[PDB]
C-alpha cells in the first residue's frame, strides 16, 4: 500500500533521507583522516607556494572586483 499520487520523486526524496543514515557508519570510517601525513607531506614540496599565490589572489580579490573602465562579458573574455 502506497500513495500512487507520489511522483517518481518518492524513491529519491526518501533515498537521501535514508542514505543520510549511512553517515554514521561512514563517519566512523573517517580513518582516512590519516591523510595528515600527506598534508604534512606538501611541506617538503614547499607547500609555501600557496602563500605567494594565496597572498596574491586573496589580496587581489579586492581589486579583482573592479575591471577595466569597461566591465563586459565580451571584451573581458576576449581580453
UniProtKB/Swiss-Prot annotation:
Question: What is this protein's function per UniProt?
Answer: Component of triglyceride-rich very low density lipoproteins (VLDL) and high density lipoproteins (HDL) in plasma. Plays a multifaceted role in triglyceride homeostasis. Intracellularly, promotes hepatic very low density lipoprotein 1 (VLDL1) assembly and secretion; extracellularly, attenuates hydrolysis and clearance of triglyceride-rich lipoproteins (TRLs). Impairs the lipolysis of TRLs by inhibiting lipoprotein lipase and the hepatic uptake of TRLs by remnant receptors.
User: Where does this protein chiefly localize?
Assistant: secreted
Q: Which residues of the full protein are shown?
A: 21 to 99 of 99
Which one GO biological process term can you cite for this protein? negative regulation of very-low-density lipoprotein particle clearance
Give the gene that encodes this protein. APOC3
**Which GO CC terms are listed, alphabetically?**
chylomicron; collagen-containing extracellular matrix; early endosome; extracellular exosome; extracellular region; extracellular space; intermediate-density lipoprotein particle; spherical high-density lipoprotein particle
- List the expressing tissues: Liver.
Question: What is this protein's record name?
Answer: Apolipoprotein C-III
Disease field reads: Hyperalphalipoproteinemia 2: A condition characterized by high levels of high density lipoprotein (HDL) and increased HDL cholesterol levels.
Q: Which family does it belong to?
A: Belongs to the apolipoprotein C3 family.
